[PDB]
Design a protein around this motif. Structure first.
Motif, mmCIF file in Angstrom:
data_model
loop_
_atom_site.group_PDB
_atom_site.id
_atom_site.type_symbol
_atom_site.label_atom_id
_atom_site.label_comp_id
_atom_site.label_asym_id
_atom_site.label_seq_id
_atom_site.Cartn_x
_atom_site.Cartn_y
_atom_site.Cartn_z
ATOM 1 N N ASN A 41 -1.703 1.134 -5.631
ATOM 2 C CA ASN A 41 -1.823 2.450 -5.060
ATOM 3 C C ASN A 41 -3.304 2.801 -5.010
ATOM 4 O O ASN A 41 -4.019 2.853 -6.053
ATOM 5 N N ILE A 42 -3.844 2.995 -3.822
ATOM 6 C CA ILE A 42 -5.269 3.281 -3.666
ATOM 7 C C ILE A 42 -5.644 4.730 -3.977
ATOM 8 O O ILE A 42 -6.818 5.120 -3.926
ATOM 9 N N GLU A 67 -7.796 -2.050 -11.718
ATOM 10 C CA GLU A 67 -8.854 -2.018 -10.731
ATOM 11 C C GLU A 67 -10.212 -2.427 -11.262
ATOM 12 O O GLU A 67 -10.558 -2.133 -12.424
ATOM 13 N N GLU A 124 -6.278 -3.332 -6.699
ATOM 14 C CA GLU A 124 -5.570 -2.179 -6.182
ATOM 15 C C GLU A 124 -4.129 -2.418 -5.775
ATOM 16 O O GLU A 124 -3.759 -3.483 -5.246
ATOM 17 N N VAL A 126 -4.279 6.237 -6.939
ATOM 18 C CA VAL A 126 -3.967 6.388 -8.345
ATOM 19 C C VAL A 126 -4.629 5.215 -9.060
ATOM 20 O O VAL A 126 -4.598 4.035 -8.606
ATOM 21 N N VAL A 127 -5.309 5.538 -10.161
ATOM 22 C CA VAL A 127 -5.944 4.536 -11.027
ATOM 23 C C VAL A 127 -4.803 4.103 -11.957
ATOM 24 O O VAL A 127 -4.305 4.872 -12.776
ATOM 25 N N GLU A 128 -4.411 2.849 -11.779
ATOM 26 C CA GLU A 128 -3.239 2.318 -12.428
ATOM 27 C C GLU A 128 -3.622 1.375 -13.535
ATOM 28 O O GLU A 128 -2.781 0.890 -14.288
HETATM 29 CA CA LIG Z 1 -5.340 2.328 -7.769
#
Ligand SMILES: [Ca+2]
Length: 223
Positions: free
Chosen positions: A54-55, A62, A52, A57-59
């Motif tokens: 940005n917790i 993860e 992670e 937004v799935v970047e």
């Molecule tokens: Ca994320």
């Protein structure tokens, strides 16, 4: 983290977010199957989120893994916060790569004056609430035991240390608990408690991980 800076995407690859529908505590990956956090972060229904930044937004980097077993320290005292540490076993092994890596446990304790890196997605204001969505880092030294004890008289045990700035302004805070304190490449503390956040003469108090290494090694080998 109050007064820290944005770490940068996956620069703290051992940082985990414990999630139960929302981020509630940090933790540290200590090998592909095990996370250590603070015992006061205990809950059933924990999902561990690795990789992670940005917790919200799935970047892409993860890994979200359910916990299969939680073990709070046998002597955790919720009244004193003495022995505030717990271990969390993952349902399946994490894939270790550049973005997801374990942190080493200490061979020796650290001394006052050592510079450490503290990180978390907790509150960023000493008065008020503003939660960041990206990981915040803070560089902070371990303070002397007398500074610690003078700030919190009758409340510090030998399983605790203070780190921060007695002048205030820079500290960990709510939402950072269970997260890592790393000094010279070793996990030396776990964000535990304090009085408010970043107040003058009220530094953060951390679980002293070097006192728990044989309990950690023995427990994970038998579970
Ligand atoms: Ca994320």
């Amino acid at each position: 983290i109050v007064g820290g800076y944005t770490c940068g995407a996956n620069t703290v690859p051992y940082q985990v977010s414990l999630n139960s529908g929302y981020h509630f505590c940090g933790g540290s990956l200590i090998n592909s199957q095990w996370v250590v956090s603070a015992a006061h972060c205990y809950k059933s229904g924990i999902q561990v989120r690795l990789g992670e930044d940005n917790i919200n937004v799935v970047e892409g980097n993860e890994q979200f893994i359910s916990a299969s077993k939680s073990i709070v320290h046998p002597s955790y005292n919720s009244n004193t916060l003495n022995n505030d540490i717990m271990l969390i076993k993952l349902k399946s092994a994490a894939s270790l790569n550049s973005r997801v890596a374990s942190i080493s446990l200490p061979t020796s304790c650290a001394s006052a004056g050592t510079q450490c890196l503290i990180s978390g997605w907790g509150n960023t204001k000493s008065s008020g609430t503003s939660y960041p969505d990206v990981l915040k880092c803070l560089k902070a030294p371990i303070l002397s035991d007398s500074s610690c004890k003078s700030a919190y008289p009758g409340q510090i045990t030998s399983n605790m240390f203070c780190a921060g700035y007695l002048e205030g302004g820079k500290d960990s805070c709510q939402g950072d608990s269970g997260g890592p304190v790393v000094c010279s490449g070793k996990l030396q503390g776990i964000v535990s408690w304090g009085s408010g956040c970043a107040q003058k003469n009220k530094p953060g108090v951390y679980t002293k991980v070097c006192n728990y290494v044989s309990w950690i090694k023995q427990t994970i080998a038998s579970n």
